[PDB]
RNA sequence: GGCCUGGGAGGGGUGGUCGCCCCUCCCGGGGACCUGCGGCGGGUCGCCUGCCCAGGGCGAGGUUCAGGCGGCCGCAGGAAGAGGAACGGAGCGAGUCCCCGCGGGCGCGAUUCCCUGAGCUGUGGGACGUGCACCCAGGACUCGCUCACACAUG
RNA sequence: CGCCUGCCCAGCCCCCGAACCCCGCGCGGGUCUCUCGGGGGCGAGGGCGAGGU
């Protein structure tokens, strides 16, 4: 997978083929993680996402 | 370079190994690569930890998205395995004897290099919680 | 001073005083189809609300999921049919659909509609879509200006053929070059296009038009109609985890960040607020007649697709406007719109047609034998009724 | 062998084992898939495999016959088709 | 070899260094295993320690003794004891019972020092209550244990909360207070319960029916010992000068009174010979007193192990070895180390 | 000086009243009510509650008995039992505040307790993991009572935290946030089974009862006795007015609906809350939602169930906004002012004519 | 007496104070009765279900052992079986619709 | 009993088993004083709580 | 050392005894305990102040919560009994030959330490009152 | 699937204003209310009907799952003009359920009533006298009594 | 091929080399889809003249 990105000042994705930003830091991979329906690590993912305050519920609420 | 790699870091990448502990871990991995004791990648490490193996699980702190390997920390805590985050993904793969980056490897013990393994293990067991 | 404030709180009298100034609302921050409810033109205020439905955001979790959708970020192994089948299995729900088939190795925006939101899938499938792909050229090119000129050339209404059938027309509205790498002969392009545009075919045509030849390395959908990749986008892990958290911790919080009500897809459309008595009639397939209009938005035009909503902000149906805004404001009677697609279930609101004044009058005349059994005139009908009552069946 | 032939298009730069051609057919009429392409003397060059570009101005690639080679054709060299394997824009446009 | 206190006991190695780890540590008695293989010691650090019989005895200077096991409790250890029918030939018999503050009655394996079993005593509210005393039956089938106004009887075979409850105080009548010690008659089918409420009680083994209730003591009773005759037995108390001699015949009143200095709220132990002729007791002053039971018990000897309280004394069942535990609670002021010791008491 | 105060510093249910949606600003004020903080001491106590710090010997029903001797009142309730040896936050509602006890008893509690382990564990992290395991919806057997075996039931633990661990005494402090009716003694038994060493709850203290906590407004039993004494002997209310708080403080989380003075007495007599009497209404009123209906002086009239949403209220001109759940205010606090309105007058006129 | 058949109740985890703690692994996540006899696959009674605890879909249970049994006997991940009439459905404990 | 506490810099109780806080001050018992309903020392408690400005009526009034 | 205990004092712990007066009071308590002429608990001290038994009432200035003993100062002022605070409850218990603390002690007069008693009494009554 | 059908005008052939066939030009028609769900849009050996020699085979048709990606057919619900400015409430009391770990809690007296126990414990533990106050309040259902039957006065 | 063991084909994951591409003056240096070769892990979709009851 070649497609990478870095976030703009506006907040949107700037797509790129390079593995570093103009400002030095690493570009994230554009594609989401692989998923399989047999996954039984929901407890595990939630447990540590709570610890570091990165669970989706704990973020600022969206504008509707 | 170590201090520069903190800019690239991941939200869940703690406890992070120190500059010196990072150096010790790479050399323990390289010794384990020669004896073919390590297990590399999520698929293998997840399989072997579930199967019943024990050792030290070295995670990469540059990994994104976090969903690829954020289940592993708790898999260790269920079986009391020690784990630690090192700064880079590319350095972990180079130390593991691969030409691609790697997000996680598990180092198993061996009679060849127990002195270096024990220095890492006890220092990693001593690491404070975030 | 904190203590000075505390002292005033216990000493001096507080009262919401009377005033003569006009009461002005601010509905700019109200959710979804209730946003700027104040700015809609008001026909009447006189009706009886029923207390049967709910505000779309605050439906009970079962009803919330059944009337909802997921802006999914599709993963890169499975097919789009397999992805929605997983979501159907996870949420423990009967039916699921999606906003456009992404190929197994393609990622990005896939609006997965759940149960009763699956009535919108045709509208979502026909919506305009944006892609970010990588074309891999077989031979070298002078520079990235040439590949941009090829994308400039293929901006417009194009001929296209499916991958391995008939020739088809597909418009590409806008196209752009993000960057090009001469070493590995890969070029990122972004394209906005109509639904059903084949991007594999576009990559081949870019290759032929340049002369070097080419194919699609990889693809990602960044937009699917109204939803984008920076708008509430969620992964298959989130969907699984949010359901699990609801099962094991009895916590709906995560589900309500994952799933959104179908009304969020319809926010672009012009609104027609119906009276609570008229709601279930329209769900049964009635005409949207003028007696039941409470409010109507500015700039409705003839043959325009409008969303017809309740006073609580639920979507009743998508509908085609027969009257303009100016006509609705001035006319006495008539058909305001006709149904395109009924969203809301039957008997969500109770069955309250045939109780009105003019409807009850017609029922009485049929009972008296002044009209026929099928509500049609006779020779004996009064000239007042026969002239005034504009039967819409005609 | 065709009874009569009508212009198909002019030669554009070659591709890998094909020749790309800009269409200049009368009233923009679109050629059929897998239709035989001919020279001015009714000698078949190849067969039309892919058709692409905008509805008014479009291109077509020709899968060459085994005898021909892509490099041999001159700049703006004209090519032909039988009129029975052409279609109007009004089929595709609406 | 046979016991003889015609001469002062000769010194034999003890342990002092490990007890000095904590500040103001002190021993809380010592007890030989009933086969005579090893000695068990309690201490203020809440660590039971087992010391093997010195090899240098059978093999002169002796090195400082080191315990083969340390088995840690998390709270004050109220009572502890060897299994009644222990032999070092059988791993199934070699184990140590132990009760502690707000904890179950733990059973510790005397070879490996692992937690082997747990007996649990709950009140009517289903809250755990700790046993202030422990005693195995002479068959080794049952584990008797004392509480406030009640004895419980756990079956040794089935470890858990299951137990036969025996109330000693019913409608303000009977033996009141915390039952601080239990002991069984070698000959008769009975057991004696001492309480921190001044009184002694005798009870039939099979039923738990009261046989007698005895006064005498002026403080809370801390220890009991039956004579190998079966008729005669002895008792001692905290902050109480007299060690009272009793008899199952001519009951109701103590036959004799033996003086000893006890000026603290401590379980100052005392012990008989295996033959039953001598009786040894510690003291808060430090002086270990000896009486010949064979009339009133005649004073034989008094000697000083150390310049400190001698809380524990234990006599070895086969050999002529006296064990002594030392130490007591130091009391502060606004702004000698304790020790186990062995002593040869054999004849010339 | 009230003119200088921002509306965010107005007391209790009048706080941030200007951010409620205004239906109409006109009404006729009546000299009837007071602000809840300025109620005459008798009425103040009869509509009040105490955020008590329960002592460690008596049962929770004994404590509330003692409070009703001291203050000389006939009724009290108590926001969920604390067991005799347990301390901490016990909301004691007095007289007319006892109408609110179900809302207080059903509220989420927080506890700080000590578990005692019966053998050693590896360390504090092992106890911390067993607490994470017992987060979420748990099975718990309710204790036997009068030989009536209650069935196994489910109770949620929202959060858990391991505060401290002492390896010497094998003692561990935990903090638990949980649903009402959770047995924390049972939690410590399970936490011991999960570790494998065994365990018992050594100690317990409730640090929160829904809206009230130990952080602020909490008083001991001595304050209650002492405040009453000062009122009895020196006729000073000052101490009592810091021990007792008006029941409006318990209702500050609820969505509000402000009513005209004309409507107040009608609602107290059992009339449904109609739309022509609504002055102001909060954002986020849903159907079948429990709301608080208040006067313009900030007094709670009743707990009501909303039959119109916020948006529906904005569109309509008449009709049932809410039905009563429980009337708080007494009848005839305000005068009867119903039947005087335009439509209601027209109805009575056209019946007579 | 011995039941006609027995269904998988759960697997052995660590012992705890002379009774055995077991992870529950029933089909359809069914919950056992209190004091329900626990059998090994040979249909021999080892004990009775004492405690039931943990999350709804990942719960444990302790087993008060029989007169003749000892907690040291059992090995890790050893399975235990229950009379299927002595189970209840999870739906019972989940809230009313 | 066993529970103690000390206040942090924002006035929240920080519970602990240890008799001294991290700054060397003594920790308070978490539990309130034992109460008797037959207590006749109300005069006495008011008398000296007034004297040392620590009666509840003399403190800063709470913001409601 | 004395100044460190001064951090732990109550709102109501005045008049606090001087460093040397604190030492005199402890030495007087030691002699009174030896003679069996003190009362230790609030439970006890309260009972014998009610009966009207005279003595110097020594209080621990670090007692919390103050509700346990804050009635006693006024009980003394009703009967004109001399009272005084001292830095710590642990030292007050230690003065009476106890490892556990106590918040109050009342020293009775007696012949064997009558001069030491009068020396303490004289300085207690001379203290400035808040 | 090289769509289907009717009328008028002109030219050619054949037979007894008439019938039939072929070509060219012009014009009309292919209808049947609204909504929801399902099916068709080659290839599923899983079921049924039919055909052939508790079994086997088949170029046809159909139902229920699985798979692939507007038009017609079938079934079901309606045949809808949109009503109602007191509807049908409250507060108490009782019976029955739910809630529901509650002999323990409090005080005083005398041998300082005993006790710094290693036993929790002096900021409290116990003994004996003695007295005292606790064991509800809520919610739901059901059958009474009281107060109203209220659209909130520009 | 009822069951079990073993072997072969297909599919999935990891490492190395060659060709191709890019840069410099036959040579040197640096990357990546597809294709070819080698090594390691894994049979129940298909096949088997082998072994066991």
Author numbering:
A (entry chain F), H (entry chain J): 1 to 64
B (entry chain E), I (entry chain I): 23 to 152
C (entry chain C): 23 to 186, 192 to 421
D (entry chain D): 66 to 159
E (entry chain K): 146 to 204, 209 to 443, 449 to 489, 510 to 522
F (entry chain G): 43 to 395
G (entry chain H): 65 to 161
Per the authors:
The human telomerase holoenzyme contains 11 accessory subunits, including histone H2A-H2B dimer, two sets of the H/ACA heterotetramers (dyskerin, NOP10, NHP2 and GAR1) and telomerase Cajal body localization factor, TCAB1 (8, 9). Recent cryo-electron microscopy (cryo-EM) structures revealed the segregation of human telomerase subunits into two lobes flexibly connected by hTR.
The H/ACA domain of hTR exhibits a dual-hairpin structure, characteristic of RNAs within the H/ACA RNP family. Each RNA hairpin associates with four H/ACA proteins including dyskerin, NHP2, NOP10 and GAR1 (30). Thus, our work provides a structural evidence for G-quadruplex formation in human telomerase. Our structure confirms that the 5’ G-quadruplex structure can co-exist with the P1a stem. The 5’ G-quadruplex packs against P4 and P4.1 stems of hTR. The G-quadruplex is also stabilized by the 5’ GAR1 within a single protomer, revealing another mode of RNA binding by GAR1. Our observation is supported by a recent study, which demonstrates that GAR1 interacts with G-quadruplex RNAs both in living cells and in vitro.
